[PDB]
Structure formats: structure tokens, C-alpha cells
């Protein structure tokens, strides 16, 4: 990770970076994960220090060395593809990229179900409703949500149980359930990290939500079906009076096609 | 001699196979036939 290398002095920094690559070869097959890529290799034209520019060059040479370091794959994480030195994204090196994005309403429910695997839930807990309301939350936000709900449930009972020892009795933990009041409380304290970002997901608007326009619905289905059965058209313009459902039509066709 | 004449036929045949309107027209029709078959 960036901070681990950048906190080091000149020489020690570059040494630790290239040493990790050598270890991966010795232990191949291996994966080298470089977190905060924008911190380890910031754009050279955006820095003044010699240490930062040298580290960028050192990472670039280490990526090229992968032609000899057989079975070593290097993965990196950044916030934006445009926050790193463009040399890293040239053919070779990091020439494959994946946009992780923000979990959708279904994924958020699945994430909550994963975090509650060890949690006893009360009958009033509805994680699907929570996942629908938690817009702008990412997996690390839902992890904090479950943790806060767990701690609230613990405080309510432990203040009366009075178990003061080095170990916790399995029985009193096993009987402890987290209720809707504990999730609601945690929701009021949680603060989404991805609220200002755009969320892209499959819409829930279907054709039954649009009144009228029977011929428009059929025409839109032909647009998406013809490119598969058969230059096929890849778009359509909605024009006409306002307030007739132009947005709903675009969502409904995405819904039925299971498209984002 | 005759052994070289058989090598001559092989060299000329490979040159013609590498240089090669009829297969371009047939291949363009074949592509349109498959699209009309499934549409
Ligand atoms: N064909 C329709 N059937 C039912 N409701 C509609 C229709 N067209 C518009 N509406 C109502 O108008 C509102 C705005 O529709 P929307 O498509 O979001 O507007 P725009 O496309 O201009 O952004 C919707 O909330 C919906 O309730």
C-alpha cells in the first residue's frame, strides 16, 4: 500500500517496493495487491519531490519485469482511473481494469445477510426494507450498520446481566437477538460514504406501471429483440408532450431485459 | 527434369492459393443467408 512505502525514507522506500516483487517470484504463483495506487504512484507531472517521481519509475520497471516473473499477477486498487500516472495504464502493466461500482438494492440485502450470518435476528427485523432505504451505502457502510446494531443490543442486556469475567458465556450471547429498534437506531447514526456518487442498477419499474402507450411498449421490445434474432438500431428518441412517461418507458425496457 | 516439374506444380499451386472475385461474392451471400435464416 502507498502509505507503507511513502512513509519510508529515500532508498528504503524503493527497496521495499521491489523486494515485495522479488518475493512474489520466489513464491510464484502469487498475486501482488497494491492498495491506494494513486498514493504509491501519483502522476509525475503533479508532484515536486524526487522520491515520488522515482517511485513511479520504479513501479513501472517492476511491472515490465513481469515478463520474467512467471505466474505473478499484480492487482491494484484506486478510486479513479484518472488519479494515477497514465503510464501504468499503457499496453502491458495494468492494461485490464474493472469498475466495481456501488452495490444495488439486491446486493445490499445480500451484504446484510452476509454480515448477519453470526447474528440472531428477531422476527421484526426486515433486511430487505433496510437495503431498499440504504441508498448511498457501500458494503463497508452496511458492515458498520450491523456492528452498531449489534453493540446496541449488547448494551441493553449486559447492563442487567452483569457478566464480568475474561470469557463470555455462550448461552447469554446465543439468546441475544437484534431487533428492528436496534437497526433503526443504527440507521439514524450511520452516514453513507457514496451518497453523492451515481448508482447504476437494474430498475424495478415494469410495463404494468405505465398507463396507455400499448404500441410504444411493443415497439421498444422489437428494438431490443431484433439485434439478437437477426445495422441493428441501438437507440430510440422519445418525443412529444411532457408528462407521458418518457423515463418510465426507458426503465421498463431495462427492467424486462434485466439490464442496468 | 520430371522430379523438378512435380515441384514446379506444387510451387505454382501454393502461389495461386495465397493470391486468391467468386469466393468473396459467395462468402458475402453466405453471411446474409445465415442472418435471414435466424431473423
Ligand atoms: N404513462 C403514464 N402512466 C402513468 N403515470 C405517468 C405516465 N406518464 C407520467 N406519469 C406520472 O408522471 C410522473 C413523471 O414521469 P417521468 O417519466 O418521471 O417524467 P419525465 O420522463 O419527464 O422525467 C411519474 O411519477 C408518473 O407517476
Curated annotation (Swiss-Prot), chain A:
It is found in: Cytoplasm, Cytosol; Endoplasmic reticulum; Nucleus; Cytoplasm, Stress granule. Changing residue 118 to H: In IBMPFD1; uncertain significance. Changing residue 36 to Q: Defect in ubiquitin-dependent protein degradation by the proteasome. Phosphorylated by tyrosine kinases in response to T-cell antigen receptor activation. Phosphorylated in mitotic cells. ISGylated. ATP 2 binds at residues 243-248. Changing residue 100 to T: In IBMPFD1; uncertain significance. The modification N6,N6,N6-trimethyllysine is found at residue 46. The modification Phosphoserine is found at residue 193. Changing residue 246 to Q: Impairs ERAD degradation of HMGCR. ATP 1 binds at residues 79, 115. It is linked to Inclusion body myopathy with early-onset Paget disease with or without frontotemporal dementia 1: An autosomal dominant disease characterized by disabling muscle weakness clinically resembling to limb girdle muscular dystrophy, osteolytic bone lesions consistent with Paget disease, and premature frontotemporal dementia. Clinical features show incomplete penetrance. Frontotemporal dementia and/or amyotrophic lateral sclerosis 6: A neurodegenerative disorder characterized by frontotemporal dementia and/or amyotrophic lateral sclerosis in affected individuals. There is high intrafamilial variation. Frontotemporal dementia (FTD) is characterized by frontal and temporal lobe atrophy associated with neuronal loss, gliosis, and dementia. Patients exhibit progressive changes in social, behavioral, and/or language function. The PIM (PUB-interaction motif) motif mediates interaction with the PUB domain of RNF31. Belongs to the AAA ATPase family. Homohexamer. Forms a ring-shaped particle of 12.5 nm diameter, that displays 6-fold radial symmetry. Part of a ternary complex containing STX5A, NSFL1C and VCP. NSFL1C forms a homotrimer that binds to one end of a VCP homohexamer. The complex binds to membranes enriched in phosphatidylethanolamine-containing lipids and promotes Golgi membrane fusion. Binds to a heterodimer of NPLOC4 and UFD1, binding to this heterodimer inhibits Golgi-membrane fusion. Interaction with VCIP135 leads to dissociation of the complex via ATP hydrolysis by VCP. Necessary for the fragmentation of Golgi stacks during mitosis and for their reassembly after mitosis. Involved in the formation of the transitional endoplasmic reticulum (tER). The transfer of membranes from the endoplasmic reticulum to the Golgi apparatus occurs via 50-70 nm transition vesicles which derive from part-rough, part-smooth transitional elements of the endoplasmic reticulum (tER). Vesicle budding from the tER is an ATP-dependent process. This is Transitional endoplasmic reticulum ATPase. It comes from Homo sapiens. The lineage of its organism: Eukaryota, Metazoa, Chordata, Craniata, Vertebrata. The gene is VCP.
Swiss-Prot record, chain B:
Enhanced expression in testis. It comes from the Eukaryota. Residues 3-15 are annotated as: VCP/p97-interacting motif (VIM). Residues 4-13 have a biased composition (Low complexity). It is found in: Cytoplasm; Cytoplasm, Cytosol; Membrane; Nucleus. Interacts with VCP through the PUB domain (via C-terminus) and VIM motif (via N-terminus); the interaction is direct. Forms a ternary complex with CAV1 and VCP. Interacts with SYVN1. Interacts with HERPUD1. Interacts with VCPKMT. May interact with DERL1. Interacts with PLAA, VCP and YOD1; may form a complex involved in macroautophagy. Interacts with LMAN1. May negatively regulate the ATPase activity of VCP, an ATP-driven segregase that associates with different cofactors to control a wide variety of cellular processes. As a cofactor of VCP, it may play a role in the transport of CAV1 to lysosomes for degradation. It may also play a role in endoplasmic reticulum-associated degradation (ERAD) of misfolded proteins. Together with VCP and other cofactors, it may play a role in macroautophagy, regulating for instance the clearance of damaged lysosomes. The UBX domain lacks key residues critical for VCP binding. This is UBX domain-containing protein 6. It comes from Homo sapiens (Human).
